[PDB]
Each structure stands twice: as C-alpha cells, then as structure tokens.
Amino acid sequence: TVLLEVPFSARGDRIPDAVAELRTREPIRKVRTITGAEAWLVSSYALCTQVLEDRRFSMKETAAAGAPRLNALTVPPEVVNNMGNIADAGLRKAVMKAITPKAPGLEQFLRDTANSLLDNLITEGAPADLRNDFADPLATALHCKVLGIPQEDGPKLFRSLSIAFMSSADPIPAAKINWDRDIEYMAGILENPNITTGLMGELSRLRKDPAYSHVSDELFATIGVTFFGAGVISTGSFLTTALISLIQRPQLRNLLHEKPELIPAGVEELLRINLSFADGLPRLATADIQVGDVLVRKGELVLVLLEGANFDPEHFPNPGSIELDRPNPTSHLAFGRGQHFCPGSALGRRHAQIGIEALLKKMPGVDLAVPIDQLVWRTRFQRRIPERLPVLW
Numbered sequence: 001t002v003l004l005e006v007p008f009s010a011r012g013d014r015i016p017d018a019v020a021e022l023r024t025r026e027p028i029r030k031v032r033t034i035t036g037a038e039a040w041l042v043s044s045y046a047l048c049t050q051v052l053e054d055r056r057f058s059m060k061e062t063a064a065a066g067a068p069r070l071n072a073l074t075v076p077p078e079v080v081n082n083m084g085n086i087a088d089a090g091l092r093k094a095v096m097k098a099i100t101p102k103a104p105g106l107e108q109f110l111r112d113t114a115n116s117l118l119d120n121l122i123t124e125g126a127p128a129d130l131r132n133d134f135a136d137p138l139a140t141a142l143h144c145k146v147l148g149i150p151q152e153d154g155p156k157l158f159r160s161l162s163i164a165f166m167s168s169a170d171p172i173p174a175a176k177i178n179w180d181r182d183i184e185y186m187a188g189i190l191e192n193p194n195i196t197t198g199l200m201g202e203l204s205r206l207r208k209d210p211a212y213s214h215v216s217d218e219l220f221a222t223i224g225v226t227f228f229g230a231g232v233i234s235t236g237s238f239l240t241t242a243l244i245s246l247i248q249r250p251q252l253r254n255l256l257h258e259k260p261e262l263i264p265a266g267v268e269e270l271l272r273i274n275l276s277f278a279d280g281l282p283r284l285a286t287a288d289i290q291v292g293d294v295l296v297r298k299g300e301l302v303l304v305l306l307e308g309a310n311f312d313p314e315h316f317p318n319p320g321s322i323e324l325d326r327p328n329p330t331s332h333l334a335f336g337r338g339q340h341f342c343p344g345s346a347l348g349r350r351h352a353q354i355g356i357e358a359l360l361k362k363m364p365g366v367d368l369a370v371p372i373d374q375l376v377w378r379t380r381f382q383r384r385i386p387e388r389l390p391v392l393w
Ligand code: HEM
Pocket: 059, 082, 083, 084, 099, 226, 227, 228, 230, 231, 232, 234, 235, 238, 239, 281, 282, 333, 334, 335, 336, 337, 339, 340, 341, 342, 343, 344, 345, 347, 348, 349
C-alpha cells in the first residue's frame, strides 16, 4: 500500500464517509498530492482555523522555488501573493469598494439577468442546463458589470477558466497562452476611455493619480484578470452545486419558494455544506509549528480541508443537515479565514441569493432531469462541478 492520496473524490454532491473517519482518527495526517509531494492534510474545524489564523502558515511562500506543491502554478509566482501585492500598492480599499454588491444598479442587474436567463430556458423547454445556461452566464455577466467591461467580452474571458483553474501535476502550456492574451485584454481596457465604471474604471483613474504613480503597471491588468477569474469560477461553481443541494431537498425548495425571506439563511447553510473547493487550501510552514499531535516543520506543505471543518460535528452538530437556525451560521470556512479571507464574499452571497430567488420564482417545480449518478464531475480541477446540470420543472 502507498501513502494516502488527495483529493479523495471529485464528486460535489456528497461528502465521502471517509472524511468523518479521518477527522475522528487523524485530524492532521500526511498525504500525497498529485505532484508526488507530501503534505499535511488538516480536517477538523479547530485545526483548520488554527492554520488559517496563523500567518506563519504562508500562502505567499507556497509559490517558492523547490517547495512541495499541491499542484502546478497556472499564474506567475508573484501573483500567488496577489492580495499582498494589492495591499502593498495601496489599492486594497479601492478594490474592496468596487466589488461590493451595494453598488447602485447591481442588485437589479443580477435579478434582470437571472430572470432573462430563465425566460430563455423556459422558452426552449425542458431539459435545461442550469450550469452552462444559468449559473455560469449569471456569474460571467455579474463580473463584467463589477469590472466595468463590455458584457460581450464575458464569454471570451470565461473560456480561459476551464484551464486556468485546473489542478494539474504539471505546468499547462494553454494556461500561459490564455494568461498572456487575457492580460493584454485587460491592459487595453485600462487605456480605453470608455471604461469609467466598476473595478477597471476605478483602476484606470488611480493609475493616473500621482499617489499611485509608482505602482507597477502590470499589477493593474493582473487585478482585472485574477478577480474576474476567481470571482466567476467561484460564484458559478458555488451556485451550481448549491442548486443541486436545493433540488435534492424538495421541502427546502418549497419552503424557500413560499418564504423567500429565509433565502439568505438558506444560502448560508448551502455555503457551509458546499463542496465546490476540490482541494484543501494550501499553506507553507515558515516555522516549526505544533498542530494537534504533529510538529509541522519549516518548509512543509499544509492543506486545509474546508469540508473537514464545515462538516465537523464538534462545531456544527448534525453537520450533514441544513438547519436555518444554527447559533453560529456564518462561522463556516466556505470563504476561508484570517489574512486571506475571501474579498468577494458579499458579492458571492448576493449572486447566490438572487439566482436562487429568481429560479424558485420562475421554476418552483425545478427538479433533476437525470438520475443524480448521471452527473459528470470535472476532474483535476480546483473546483468540483458537474459538466452539465440537466433539469426539468
Ligand atoms: C461563493 C463564492 C466564493 C467562494 C465560495 C469563495 C471562496 C474563497 C476562499 C475559500 C478563499 C480563501 C483561499 C485561501 O485562503 O487560500 C478565497 C479567496 C479569494 N477570493 Fe473568493 N470566493 C467566492 C467569491 C469570490 C469573488 C466574487 C471574488 C472576486 C470578485 C473572489 C476573489 C477572491 C480572491 C482574489 C481571493 C484571494 C484572497 C487572498 O489571497 O488574500 N472570490 N475565496
């Protein structure tokens, strides 16, 4: 027998029985990644939070030359430190303000786009693909709006993502090609006088502001590419697997349809049980640090298994069930924790809440149109998603 390998399963509709067993017996244990490197897999809520809240477990240094790797880089090394670069350039507050869902028109844009997507589906008739023809276009449309770039440009940028967020043992030639092309697109956007709204609009004017004159010009285009990619792949994938969890629970579906004011509470539970992250979050130990029964050594790789924490019965009793009245409802790790907590968390919540609200209104009888085992789960990818999500209503 060989050392236990990660990831365990590409299926995003059920957590393996093995996670519970692992968490109970060995909440931190050694595993092998797809590159052949060894790593510590952390799977209890307590130890996951300890790692995420201790900056000596570094995200930046996972990109160091010769480090044990979860997967191959699909960005330049320094872009792993993207938020650190943004903060050092003085751009953190501006980036945050631009990607809030409280921007005027934004919530109405989401509703209009979702409703328009659903009407098209209805007109075509069942079956409909809720991933390719609903959740992902909605994510793509949203991030075009958030960035301030043409809606028409969305599908072209989206096409990079099935490779850009691969979880590969080896570097990917196509990833570099798409990167260079997408970076050039965003640089053009910065020079485009028509682009005055959203994130790219704000970055364009900060670029001409004397207070930012010494900010690297390549960081501006990089922010656009990375926030579009991360936002679209994360919201599209989350909404998709959230719709599966909802569909699998007709009474919850009915309840939220009847009482839509419960939808935010519903989405928060759907976030907690969400299996969209295919791998643990990687960190490199920059010191010798005790984690449970293991002294992690400087230079070693640690993987924070989000569903390990989020299904931990010591923190979330009956973790497999959706409870709209938990006393600790946002304390899940779906958005991470600590220094690198997701900057798009508000946008991600609203994308899901509005998508679900529109869906339940337009398709109250929504149900899977194929047996659940017929869903095709994407492999070697940083997210777990079904290639198609056929439904009827
Ligand atoms: C439901 C939707 C989303 C989920 C589940 C999600 C999940 C996460 C998680 C778990 C992390 C932490 C990664 C780590 O600590 O290693 C993260 C970070 C990040 N997220 Fe999200 N995210 C979502 C939406 C978004 C959106 C809408 C954006 C931007 C528009 C975004 C951009 C980012 C960026 C740039 C980081 C890196 C933060 C850093 O390095 O400090 N995400 N996300």
